[PDB]
Point group: C2
């Protein structure tokens, strides 16, 4: 169900990194969209730092007039959710689009696999 995905976005977006990390299964992984064409794997032990650096960047992004937005999860069965996201200017021009793929098991996130459409 979508509830663990929701908890993850609410807690990580408020800097509650402890409960955000605990949304992941002990062997869960978070795979970024870049990683030199392969994606960088982060294990549960590294997701707290990743969230922290990501929030710091998002602050500098917003001050510069671009914001990330994400939609509510679209569930396919109980154990898979798709989060569509955008980067857009403060007036609504979308400049980048992507998806987060969430694979769940027993109410924990086993995989958060991030993709972006590719820019210039």
């Amino acid at each position: 169900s979508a509830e663990v995905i929701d908890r993850f976005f609410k807690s990580s977006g408020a800097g509650d990194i402890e409960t955000a990390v605990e949304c992941f299964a002990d062997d869960g992984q978070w795979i970024t969209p870049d990683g030199d064409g392969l994606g960088t794997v982060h294990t549960k032990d590294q997701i707290g730092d990743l969230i922290t650096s990501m929030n710091a960047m998002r602050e500098k992004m917003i001050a510069s007039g671009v914001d990330g937005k994400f939609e509510s999860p679209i569930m396919f069965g109980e154990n898979m959710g798709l989060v569509r996201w955008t980067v857009e200017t403060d007036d609504g021009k979308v400049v980048n689009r992507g998806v987060d793929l969430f694979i769940l098991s027993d109410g924990k996130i086993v995989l958060k696999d991030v993709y972006r459409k590719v820019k210039l």
Copy 2:
């Protein structure tokens, strides 16, 4: 999963007409690039799309790099996830991605392609 299986076999063998017919009339194929948004192709344009993809894959193989794909993983009934790689003939993966397939009434409504990004 059947329409996805049919799609890869027919397009991968140059049968573009039956491959195009795997798509719903309002279906779409969205590329992974297209200046950060993805380029949308409708059913009318998917035939030319496959043909140019097959022509590229010929030059890829001659140059010693090959694309590979995993069998679809269904989540629910109307969504299939196909993981793919680009790898040398030696097994080293140089790029990874996914195709997201959305189905309705046995046709492909969305084929949404994503790749992991290089510098």
